[PDB]
Amino acid sequence: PDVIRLDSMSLFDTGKWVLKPGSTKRLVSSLMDIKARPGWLIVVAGHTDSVGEEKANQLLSLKRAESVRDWMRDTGDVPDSCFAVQGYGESRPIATNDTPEGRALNRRVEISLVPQVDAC
Numbered sequence: 001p002d003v004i005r006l007d008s009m010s011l012f013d014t015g016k017w018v019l020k021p022g023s024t025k026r027l028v029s030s031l032m033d034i035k036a037r038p039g040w041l042i043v044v045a046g047h048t049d050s051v052g053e054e055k056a057n058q059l060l061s062l063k064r065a066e067s068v069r070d071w072m073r074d075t076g077d078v079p080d081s082c083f084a085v086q087g088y089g090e091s092r093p094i095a096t097n098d099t100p101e102g103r104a105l106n107r108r109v110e111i112s113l114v115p116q117v118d119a120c
Ligand SMILES: [Cl-]
Pocket: 015, 016, 017, 018
């Protein structure tokens, strides 16, 4: 009974929490992974690049997790109680913040499926 980590999804432009154009294939991919594990808690964690202010990035990271939760629930018909949203702000980069490509990779959402918590 291991937690399942889905692939990271870098779906956001600077200071934005809306799902940028061309995000549908990566979203559908996570959705399918969610549909294969009915009832697992869907932990949706948002992240930011290190540009801007730490407190501002915390709120932004959480709004990004909420945008993905909202898509999965409204477009993916996943019950609302399945989700738990989390924000890491700029604290856990996956790429350098020294380049635009690196910062774009850090603007992202990570999904973990947790079986020990009942959620749906
Ligand atoms: Cl926005």
